[PDB]
Amino acid sequence: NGLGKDHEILRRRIENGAKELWFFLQSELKKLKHLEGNELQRHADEILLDLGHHERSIMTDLYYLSQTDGAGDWREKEAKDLTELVQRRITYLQNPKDCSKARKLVCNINKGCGYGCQLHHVVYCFMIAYGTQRTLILESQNWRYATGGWETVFRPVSETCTDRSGLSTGHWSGEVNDKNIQVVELPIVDSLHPRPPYLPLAVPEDLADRLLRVHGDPAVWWVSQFVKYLIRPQPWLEKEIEEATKKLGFKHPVIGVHVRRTDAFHPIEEYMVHVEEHFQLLARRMQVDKKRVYLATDDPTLLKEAKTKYSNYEFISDNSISLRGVILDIHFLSQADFLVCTFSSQVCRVAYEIMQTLHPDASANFHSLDDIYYFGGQNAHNQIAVYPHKPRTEEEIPMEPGDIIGVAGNHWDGYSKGINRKLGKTGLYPSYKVREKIETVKYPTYPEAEK
Amino acid sequence: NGLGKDHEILRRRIENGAKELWFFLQSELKKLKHLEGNELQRHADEILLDLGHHERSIMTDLYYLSQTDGAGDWREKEAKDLTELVQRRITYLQNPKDCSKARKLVCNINKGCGYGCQLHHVVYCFMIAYGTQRTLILESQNWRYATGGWETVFRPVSETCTDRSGLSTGHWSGENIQVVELPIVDSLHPRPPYLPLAVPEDLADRLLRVHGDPAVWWVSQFVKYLIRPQPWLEKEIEEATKKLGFKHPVIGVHVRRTDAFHPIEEYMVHVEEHFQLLARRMQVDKKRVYLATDDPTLLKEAKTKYSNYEFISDNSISLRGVILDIHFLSQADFLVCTFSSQVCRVAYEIMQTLHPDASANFHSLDDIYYFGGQNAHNQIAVYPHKPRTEEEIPMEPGDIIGVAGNHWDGYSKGINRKLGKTGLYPSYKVREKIETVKYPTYPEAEK
């Protein structure tokens, strides 16, 4: 069971490429120290240009390393097996034989917010139902986006059990006090007391190791399984999506861009820099016939501006063809090869979540101009310091290996902001010096779903 | 038969480490454009310090990746299998049953140069003997380093056949002469194919799975057989190891001064950087350096300027001295020297026989690895290059590049043979052109 030749050649090529980059940077930075004025700026720009191509060659070799010696086919098979297992468990939970006797969790969709926020409310309900072995019952009467209900757009969340009948009923009071309550009604997350453990960003302990073999952010993978089940379309929506795909000429490669302007302002150029950079990366391993962008935005003037400012790009948008508009936007963004947006937007986060269900590991196929991935209502997102940090400025925090860091965000400039939970200090630290603290929870594993 | 969890975690951490380095560089280089004077120089220095630690963290993760999920154990087993195979073949070639009837190649060690050049002459003789299925006969009478000759330090190269007897003798004229006398490589015509940097075609694929520079591994197999020590030299080395306190981690430094000059400070920048890398994965109790040099002022200079280092030298207890220096350099965890020096190349070659893949465990202040008399060392361009200055050459993917050297600054110098043009090109844009030769495989050595 030996090492593959391609694997070893690529590993050594990545090591050598990184070494050569370090040789280059040592030489060129020392030369910059002795320049000034226009020559300093001209040479700095040239260094940046060269560095970019060098960096993308290293990233390309890393991509090949992830695929070599059967790794891509195996990752695809394991990711498929994992989602089939979870979807099987969810479907088993949701379709009891005898609805009148089934334990149930009632969720109301009419949270006071937009479509993404309402979808995520249902997900939060669903994850707790799954954790407490309760069938999710979804109440959607007079839903803002479709007054006919949830089932006018998506499939019902159960085929056998959509009725709320039960011997006992009560508001959520905790898994222990609700032990003998057949039907529990759940409020929005920011009213939930006591909080159960079945919340993001933890993942099921029984799946955690398998997921780390496949996926770079198991927490978002776990969320995405409930999104996947919820958005199973009714046949008319499925047909509308297929026909819109043709009408728009949506085809690959394509990068999705979501520009949310209705309040945090970012000019179109700050999105497109990352779009152009990713197309440069793709072109190192595939022919790019045309640079396509699927643009979703609440700014009605932006599409025309983008087309005129970037005449070498093809812009695709559903503006030509409300609930329909957001559903289609989320769909096409989720199908793109890469996603550039602001994760402060619920819409972009939904698209990123759905994206994880379409590939073995799409966890890194985004760039956010502000927030890192999060789920409203999640438990604290912590990291563990791996290397020490001594602050250079007063805005930086010290770190020793083992310190728990509560991460607020990545500034996408080498530094993150967070709080050192051994010291109580909040500030900046080098992003590379921490690792993610993955939290696991003992969920039911529904072994009966395998028979 | 799936993917290992540690393997995947480490791959993603390397990828993310590289992305974070790029975020940092993009941000900081844009800041530098708007600085001046002492502020520009203070921030450039700070960026370089921060970049060093970030780079070493990536290189550490790559080291772990090379070892994870059984890879280190497999690489060691396969590298051991490969050297056992080749040593078995050499030993079979060298020990025919009837010396009077064996085909022979005669090599005279007394080349007009120093010990490292003489040893490499014998290696060159040996590789051609191996290629032609001739038993190597080594003549070392009147050896400048010992009147008793080769066997006063190293084992005879054969146990059964050490004389020049036969029915016909002649000077090399190209591949029915039983005893052929080989000259120095500079006088060799016609050249046979059994020369560095090519490797045996039957081993090339297995070597690529194990080792980062198969050419030097192949050279090192003949070095290994030649320098088998006599029992008294074996004991002397063991005693020296004890008397000197040679132990790990330890970095080898060879400073050749007898005619280009490099000050001790230049070697020590690379020593210090490597000890910083090692400290990320192991405890470094004391920073030990084995220092070898022809300059009598240098050991004292180093000790006085680097009081935080322990400098080891066999001078603290000429053929004896070079052999011990080469031994301890070859045993070090890392080697800093000038590959223009035959002695340092010998130590690097021996080092390859002591680890699964030590190909990258050096820093040369001048030349890349080479073997005197080798055939042209070529590379293949992988990415196009458009020259920015007049000192640079253009390249298109597939162009054959004849490499003269690496300038250790991001650029190499060489000739684009398609264009006949010589100049600089980005080192990362080429890959090595590995040459293979059909050598005998000595199947009889397995029986």
Radius of gyration of chain A over alpha carbons? Answer: 24 Å
C-alpha termini separation of chain A:
35 Å
| Percentage of residues in DSSP E strands of chain A | 15-25%
One letter per element, helices H and strands E, the order of chain A comes to: HHHEHEEEEHHHEHEHEHEHEEEEEEE
Percentage of residues assigned to helices of chain A: 25-40%
Secondary structure class of chain A reads: alpha/beta
Apparent shape of chain A: globular
Let me know the number of strands of chain A: 16
In a few lines, what is going on in this structure?
Chain A is α/β, with parallel strands linked by helices.
Question: Would you kindly provide a written description of the structure presented here, covering whatever features stand out?
Answer:
- 2 copies of one chain form a homodimer.
- Chain A is 39% helix and 16% strand.
- Chain A is an alpha/beta fold and 451 residues long.
- The longest helix of chain A is centred in the first third of the chain and has 31 residues.
- Chain A: It is found in: Golgi apparatus, Golgi stack membrane.
- Chain A: Catalyzes the addition of fucose in alpha 1-6 linkage to the first GlcNAc residue, next to the peptide chains in N-glycans.
- Chain A: This is Alpha-(1,6)-fucosyltransferase.
